[PDB]
Structure formats: C-alpha cells, structure tokens
Write a protein that binds this ligand. Structure first.
Ligand code: NA
Length: 122
C-alpha cells in the first residue's frame, strides 16, 4: 500500500511512459497525458498508464489474460474507460498535485502539467 501520488511519481521518474515525464531537473513540475475521448473507445496505447494503476490495485493481472489475441484485446478494451476514470479521480484526490497548465486541447499532444505543492508540511 502506497498512495497514488507516490506511486505516480515513481512512474514519472521511471520515464517508461510516453508523455509522462518531469519538466525540470528539480523535479517539482511534471506533465501527464490527458486525452479527451468522449464517446470513443480507448485503444491499448491510450490506456497504458491507466492500466498500470489497475495492475497496481490488483484489478488486472500483470501478464494480462490468457485469451486469444482478439478476445484478449476486447477484454482489456472494455475495462479501459473505467481505468481512465479511476486514475483521473485518484489524481484529482491527490491534493499535493497543483494543476499549472491544461494542454489537453492539443490533439497531437494533449497533457496536463502539475507542480508539487509548495506547502507540504507533514
Ligand atoms: Na490533483
């Protein structure tokens, strides 16, 4: 058990997720991909970070499911909107993260930029 915010910072610093990166050396500001789907389904690429959180919460096996390729995709596909919803709510509930800029409008690279709260005491 770790909090989402600490979990997420570990993923950011990993540099393993495209679009999920630190924006300064000081590591006080980072960006998080933030696509607007609406009606549209999430493909696998759209859901990489959301899926990581679900696996973290034991809501999805780390290896995925042992189904055939088409049925494997569709099984995940049908989970991805809830995963996206669960992640974003968790991020909102992480008061440590202060939204600084909202670039989710840009379709070639929609993301949101957060800063670490300058009043973390204990
Ligand atoms: Na937040």
């Amino acid at each position: 058990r770790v909090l989402f915010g600490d979990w997420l910072l570990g993923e950011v610093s990993s540099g393993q997720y495209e679009g999920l990166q630190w924006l300064n050396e000081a590591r006080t500001v980072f960006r998080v991909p933030w696509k607007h789907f609406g009606r549209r389904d999430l493909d696998e690429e759209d859901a990489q970070i959301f899926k990581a959180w679900a696996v973290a919460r034991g809501r999805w096996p780390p290896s995925g499911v042992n189904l055939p390729p088409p049925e494997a995709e569709a099984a995940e596909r049908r989970e991805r909107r809830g995963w996206k919803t669960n992640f974003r709510c968790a991020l909102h509930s992480t008061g440590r993260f202060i939204l600084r800029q909202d670039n989710s409008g840009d379709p070639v690279d929609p993301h949101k930029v957060y800063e670490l709260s300058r009043e973390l005491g204990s």
